Curated annotation (Swiss-Prot), chains A, B:
GO terms for molecular function: ATP binding; ATP hydrolysis activity; ATP-dependent protein folding chaperone; CTP binding; dATP binding; disordered domain specific binding; DNA polymerase binding; enzyme-substrate adaptor activity. Molecular chaperone that promotes the maturation, structural maintenance and proper regulation of specific target proteins involved for instance in cell cycle control and signal transduction. Undergoes a functional cycle that is linked to its ATPase activity which is essential for its chaperone activity. This cycle probably induces conformational changes in the client proteins, thereby causing their activation. Interacts dynamically with various co-chaperones that modulate its substrate recognition, ATPase cycle and chaperone function. It comes from Homo sapiens (Human). This is Heat shock protein HSP 90-alpha. The chain holds residues 16 to 223 of 732 of the full protein. ATP binds at N36, D78, K97, F123. GO terms for cellular component: apical plasma membrane; axonal growth cone; basolateral plasma membrane; brush border membrane; cell surface; cytoplasm; cytosol; dendritic growth cone.
Length: 208, 208
């Protein structure tokens, strides 16, 4: 059923830093998620060159941004390579530890939170706007998994008995009460135009 | 022996654009090569988590910058994942085609050559400073290969009968006559400090 894991100490520390530090420029989270989606789309596109059977789970390579004012969620959907259970746990992860240490060191040296992506830990910027993050993922070599964290030093991983998604990753941002601007059409459009204008995949902003 | 290949039409076009366009800010090439080295180092570091036998070919994860005023070359050495023969040909490549089209489209829309890396074709910025590029590569699943191009619409690939390198990629920039500043200690140091200050691997600048 539901497995509960402790984040590595440095990741828990980074997450607390992101939740507690005063930082108004919260919009940067979106560029980080779109960039990770783009990297996962590049990964499946690269593997499909030698083995074309990897596109059987889905041909379309895109990113959908889905605001839901009722549920107070902003969903980032991609049809990238997706993640295995091993990737959900082992990845972010030991690889994150190095980047986390270097980013926190840089912050003491006068650096800004907007430079988080340069340390491979850009995803954690989601906690600038979200009280909880749910990640639904599907990789060709594994089943559909659900990862979840409200930070607090832990995360959960469970098999997803929900609706199948073929292949890719869905990031569901359960927004904080005072961060509902990231559900507005004009606001999302402005951020995408400013930070994600040169992404090599269609980005569709859904409307309600 | 030596196999000669034609670049895809769009890549040949991009390379001619890089060689012929007037653009003074040529130093950007170094950030692009260091960034690709860093990505290949991340790749071997990630694969070594599940399979630790991948580090048998080399434990140290670093980048060396080697200027040679006699040969008029600047060498960028990394101990990253390296490339197979298939990667040297098939990669840069079909994946490059999309990024090339998007980058040339962006340039017409008022964009700058410094944004090349955002389209996954950053390596081609080497031709801002180099008349010829030699690439020596070693991946765990293949033999040692040598890739070479003076642009002009073609490249060569041959098995490398030279000195083995264990694992990684070596980029040898045969600099243009008027681009010898990229061999100076103070100049390389300045560029590394300005553009590559937050790379998560040691960068060693060799001296002569
Ligand atoms: C692993 C990764 C790192 C860097 C770029 C891409 C990937 N990546 C992804 C992917 C990851 C993230 C991401 O960072 N999430 C969800 C945070 C996580 C929580 C728990 C585990 S990871 C994302 O926002 C969208 C994505 O498409 N799919 N496949 C793949 O390789
Ligand atoms: C393929 C790639 C793309 C993006 C980042 C890393 C890689 N990469 C590399 C690698 C590539 C380049 C590079 O771009 N070169 C040499 C141009 C080329 C000419 C002919 C073929 S590629 C480099 O400067 C250093 C590197 O360590 N090794 N392993 C791996 O995956």
């Amino acid at each position: 059923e539901v497995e509960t894991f402790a984040f590595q100490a440095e990741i828990a520390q980074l997450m607390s830093l992101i939740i507690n530090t005063f930082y108004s420029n919260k919009e940067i989270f979106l560029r980080e998620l779109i960039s990770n989606s783009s990297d996962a789309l590049d990964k499946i596109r690269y593997e499909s060159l030698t083995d074309p059977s990897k596109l059987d789970s889905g041909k379309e390579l895109h990113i959908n941004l889905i605001p839901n004012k009722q549920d107070r969620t902003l969903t980032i959907v991609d049809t990238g390579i997706g993640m295995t259970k091993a990737d959900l746990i082992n990845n972010l992860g030991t690889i994150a530890k190095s980047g986390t240490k270097a980013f926190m060191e840089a912050l003491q040296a006068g650096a800004d939170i907007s430079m988080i992506g340069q340390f491979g830990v850009g995803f954690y910027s989601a906690y600038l706007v979200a009280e909880k993050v749910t990640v639904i993922t599907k990789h060709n070599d594994d089943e559909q998994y659900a990862w979840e964290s409200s930070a607090g030093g832990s995360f959960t991983v469970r098999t997803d008995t929900g609706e199948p998604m073929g292949r890719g990753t869905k990031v569901i941002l359960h927004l904080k009460e005072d961060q509902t601007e990231y559900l507005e059409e004009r606001r999302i459009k402005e951020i995408v135009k400013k930070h994600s204008q040169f992404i090599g995949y269609p980005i569709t902003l859904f409307v309600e």
